[PDB]
Amino acid sequence: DQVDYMDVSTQQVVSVGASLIPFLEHDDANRALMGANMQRQAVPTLRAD
Amino acid sequence: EEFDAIKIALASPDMIRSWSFGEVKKPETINYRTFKPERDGLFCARIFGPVKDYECLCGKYKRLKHRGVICEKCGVEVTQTKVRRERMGHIELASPTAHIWFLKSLPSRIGLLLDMPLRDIERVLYFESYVVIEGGMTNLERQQILTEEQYLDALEEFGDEFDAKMGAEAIQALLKSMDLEQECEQLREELNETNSETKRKKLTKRIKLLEAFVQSGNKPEWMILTVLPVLPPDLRPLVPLDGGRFATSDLNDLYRRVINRNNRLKRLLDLAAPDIIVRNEKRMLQEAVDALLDNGRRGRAITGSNKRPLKSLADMIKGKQGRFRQNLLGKRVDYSGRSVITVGPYLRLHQCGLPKKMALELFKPFIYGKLELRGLATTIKAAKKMVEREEAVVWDILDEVIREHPVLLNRAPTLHRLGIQAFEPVLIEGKAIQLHPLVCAAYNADFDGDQMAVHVPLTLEAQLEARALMMSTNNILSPANGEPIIVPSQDVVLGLYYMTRDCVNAKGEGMVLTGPKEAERLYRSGLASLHARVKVRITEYEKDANGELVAKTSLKDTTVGRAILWMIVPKGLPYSIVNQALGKKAISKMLNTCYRILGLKPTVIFADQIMYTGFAYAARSGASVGIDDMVIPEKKHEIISEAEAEVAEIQEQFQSGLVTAGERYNKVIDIWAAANDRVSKAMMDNLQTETVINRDGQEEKQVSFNSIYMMADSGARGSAAQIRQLAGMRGLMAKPDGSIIETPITANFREGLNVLQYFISTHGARKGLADTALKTANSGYLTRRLVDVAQDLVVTEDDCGTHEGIMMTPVIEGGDVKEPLRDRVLGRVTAEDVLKPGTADILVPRNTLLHEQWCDLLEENSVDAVKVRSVVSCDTDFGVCAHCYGRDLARGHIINKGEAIGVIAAQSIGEPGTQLTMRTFHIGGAASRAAAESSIQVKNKGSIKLSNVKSVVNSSGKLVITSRNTELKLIDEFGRTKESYKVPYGAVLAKGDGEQVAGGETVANWDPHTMPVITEVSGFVRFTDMIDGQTITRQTDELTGLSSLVVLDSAERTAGGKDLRPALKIVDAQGNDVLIPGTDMPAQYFLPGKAIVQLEDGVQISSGDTLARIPQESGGTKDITGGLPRVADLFEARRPKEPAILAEISGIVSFGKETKGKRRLVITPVDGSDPYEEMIPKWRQLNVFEGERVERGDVISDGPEAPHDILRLRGVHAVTRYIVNEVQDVYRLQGVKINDKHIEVIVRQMLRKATIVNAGSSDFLEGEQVEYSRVKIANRELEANGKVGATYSRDLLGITKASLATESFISAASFQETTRVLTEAAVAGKRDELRGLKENVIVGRLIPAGTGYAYHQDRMRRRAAG
RNA sequence: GAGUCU
Ligand SMILES: [Mg+2]
Ligand SMILES: [Mg+2]
Ligand SMILES: [Zn+2]
Ligand SMILES: [Zn+2]
């Protein structure tokens, strides 16, 4: 009865970069940071797989 | 070109014109259409020279046919264009302008010399007020400022009787008139009558100036510039950008302002304009000249078009981007490249993969040289095209040059010398460098895209230096610590671990093999596992008393894999070395064993063979990482539910108002920190001994072969700490502050963190990664400071003939011996003849190296402490002797003469601070302190032996300690210190002093989150200076009304009770004071700030009761970041805020008079009847209880020691041991291995200078601090020839100051303070004779050390002999 | 100014 509000989605504390990391829940914050930053640096290949 | 030394002086107006080859009288640069030097412009050809080689402007005289010909038409000399960067110029300023470096750079120089304030001089410069230069009648005083109104007074009344003027003219005439000989005498003679400290400081500095000013050949006139020199054009170029745009230096823009205002000034003086207009122009000239020299110093820096300020001349000398640090102490280099590195596990330790196309561009001149010799190319242009086409013949020649021709490889950051190593190149197919895995540790190079720089040693000297010194195979041990840096990691450890480790039966148990080759036969044949227990015949070679190897054959009970590994093992090592399951820590000892038994060659081959087989068997194993490998204990949810209830209990008692917020905070962290231990102990117990196997008998168990466990147990990668976060419990996370978050993460990475647990984890993630970027600069700046002081220090002598050294007791601190005597004393010349206990036969000679053989004998006879020859104690003037330093830790043998110890020492200290700032920070997430030191449990039986302890028995019947630095020893049967502990103040001992205890007995017990104030007498409590609201506060509860009192400190205290000291005074039943037994001290314990008190006024007490409880909040996890400031402060020799007081002279104490709380000590020694008095604060409760036989350097006030007070009272050896122990304790907390000799190196440089007290027979006399080396060379001649002996006192210096104190100004200006160093050297007329390494690195000479040591001393005999 | 190795 004391509850006033609730988080809308499970994803809201994270960014767009970090939302695309699967199993982010099992990754260290330090490595997750570099992973989201390197995911941006990923050159697109000849065949989009 | 070749020369002896460099000198700095002021530029005379006459001297400036000598450098000039014409006056720039116009600001014009170039004609916009015909792009040429303008008529007497900034880029004039008539003055600075021709643009092309040997070509005048008009083009009348061309080439060398007309050699030294000055054209009549344009007026331009037919010479090389080289003359344009070399010839200078000048500007004849119509009015004098002060030099800003000799005005603003404090001390003011112009003001210090005139004894006239800087404010007063500036008023004259900007024409606000006149200054009297020489008042004829002394009505008007000299150097008295007269305001514009006060000038009008004297003008009508006196007129010619006074000569007061205004502007830089007045300050220059003021500097002209002053006589240095007459004023200097007067300052000397008039210092006698007063004799204070700041007069004698400033008047003596003025005498030093006046004397140095005369002897330097400088005149005070030259402080003010009448002439302004011009920089050569090429050094401030106007060059064309590719497009039509041009580009120019910021100096051209500042020169143009100066010339415009100087030319306009000349015209306004021609026009005889009013003085108002003339003054404005003189102000603007000063501004433009001061902006040219140093832009941002006097006022707002003059900005150009970009909004940034214009870069001045001073700027191109000063700081980082100055010539010194960027273009002279460091350089861009030819025959260099870089690339992304990758593994080369096929390579040998002396090899590196060097790409084809890199090596082609790198070794170009050597190819053109072979192509002419083989007769393939006629000229170099022909050879150039052969290489450009990449002909088949060229690859073959490239291959020919590179054989037996080393290349240097470098990584950033270059923390220590092993950051550059030499290798023999192997040409490869791709574009990527292949690096040897074993040297990866030295470089700190992981292959995740690191880049490494390539350098070609061109000269034959350099090829030999690369191969002899810097080769990878030559550099195995670390220079920091006598241990191998070349040590297998990752797969290699895991592979030998998997090989050696045994397992229950397995395939083929209890077999019997002919040799290590039949073990490889049954393994490869597939009839035996590597883990099968088997009897094997192995023949081990153990070395005899002489060099000869003795062969011994025996049946050995080892596994198949252990037999196979013996094949790698060279002959010389026992079989016992490969009989254990090998991990990283053991494999490191294998190469250290092998290095000391066999040599260099065997270790290099052994290290490789270990690498090869280690990788191979790692791959065979198929060790992997799955989610099932992260076993969680079944009893985790059980532990958390118990621990949650425990923490809920303190939080519910906090709502009641029994426990406070600070108490709960520390108490909750202890419950969770022990719960993390409980879960992790359950995890490693359910992980390590989980494998339960059925042997051919029935059933037994062994260590688990869980893949992750093997990886952490072997030490290949990870540790038990990491496995907590994976399988067990994540733990307490650290706040960005450093303090610990109260809610820890229960979950682990296998189970997954929820939304909040991640959000909490990020606090600690970012703070770690933040220190990796930011705090590395504080640490790396330490590396820099340490190098600049130790730089010049080199092994000069074989043996100094000194008999001195530092006594090295073994570091037995905290139960287990942290560092044996053996480790600390290894590779050090025995100072004094140290024999065995029975003093009747010498055991070790005075002048002998400490080899591992001698060190083993020290443990046999149980040598407790050993006096050892140190670097500090060396009596060498020039540098240090080989004996005092001892063994080169990197080489494992006596150090060579010529090797540069200073830089090696600075690097070894600086590196681990710097790199560990990046290590447990990227890796760091969680906090893991366990500072809950509640109680000491003694482990061996012993008699209890306390030292520096003064305790008192309490009502309970318990020995309560009332002394701060109490130590507890553990004495064995014969009488030697085995264990040592720190017992704190107000601690309860189980047994007193001398009593026997058993093993596993709690000998001491106390509360860690509180620092109690305990009494020494019984009676009643009295409140003194404890007014509510001013000094303390008060808060009550309910029904009854228990109130606690909290003492406010100067932060939470009003101005009313500032000088009031709050204390709980002891009284008896009558109401009078209670004297402390055997002293005239009425009992009074002073309570400090934030001191919580439960007992209110009027409470009966016994001796040993706790009066107040001072909170002890230190929940910060000590990483490198919190300890490095301590290390910086120790090396910089800073007194703390509360230095402990020490006795200056040995003798009988008598307490004296008092100043309203503050104590005096008129101590009158037995021999020295003359007294020594010294003031003491009120609140410092003293350890010494007066009337006592106190010696030099006895702790009077408890607290931290100033290193100055240590050196001053207890000599050099005391302060050396204070710095070594205190600094090294910080590195020991972090597990960093640095030999004491490296700290001792820098301490020696800190103990450089010395102040001369008594007069000498030279020109030292009194007050003048000179280097130690110099005064001793004088004392050698004085002791023999006679005349007045010079009494002395060695002074301690911080790093930053000792670096600037060096006589070499080029070393000083290259370090820091470039603006100040150059001005103080210029006025003293100092000459730097280029002593140290920085000086020769700058001038581009051979280092006067290392290989060039021999060459520099050969020049020095040429100088002596005629 | 946006990155890469520490
Ligand atoms: Mg790596
Ligand atoms: Mg890397
Ligand atoms: Zn000409
Ligand atoms: Zn010596």
mmCIF file with all atom_site columns, C-alpha atoms and ligand atoms in Angstrom, chain B residues 56-60 71 73-74, ligand 3:
data_model
loop_
_atom_site.group_PDB
_atom_site.id
_atom_site.type_symbol
_atom_site.label_atom_id
_atom_site.label_alt_id
_atom_site.label_comp_id
_atom_site.label_asym_id
_atom_site.label_entity_id
_atom_site.label_seq_id
_atom_site.pdbx_PDB_ins_code
_atom_site.Cartn_x
_atom_site.Cartn_y
_atom_site.Cartn_z
_atom_site.occupancy
_atom_site.B_iso_or_equiv
_atom_site.pdbx_formal_charge
_atom_site.auth_seq_id
_atom_site.auth_comp_id
_atom_site.auth_asym_id
_atom_site.auth_atom_id
_atom_site.pdbx_PDB_model_num
ATOM   1 C  CA . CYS B 1 56 ? 71.757 37.944 -53.641 1.00 0.00 ? 56 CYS B CA 1
ATOM   2 C  CA . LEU B 1 57 ? 68.212 39.427 -53.913 1.00 0.00 ? 57 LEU B CA 1
ATOM   3 C  CA . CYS B 1 58 ? 68.569 41.291 -57.264 1.00 0.00 ? 58 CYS B CA 1
ATOM   4 C  CA . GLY B 1 59 ? 70.439 38.209 -58.609 1.00 0.00 ? 59 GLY B CA 1
ATOM   5 C  CA . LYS B 1 60 ? 73.668 39.947 -59.719 1.00 0.00 ? 60 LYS B CA 1
ATOM   6 C  CA . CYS B 1 71 ? 76.283 42.987 -53.505 1.00 0.00 ? 71 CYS B CA 1
ATOM   7 C  CA . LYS B 1 73 ? 72.915 47.051 -55.353 1.00 0.00 ? 73 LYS B CA 1
ATOM   8 C  CA . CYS B 1 74 ? 70.571 45.259 -52.907 1.00 0.00 ? 74 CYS B CA 1
HETATM 9 ZN ZN . ZN  D 2 .  ? 72.096 42.019 -55.386 1.00 0.00 ? 3  ZN  D ZN 1
#
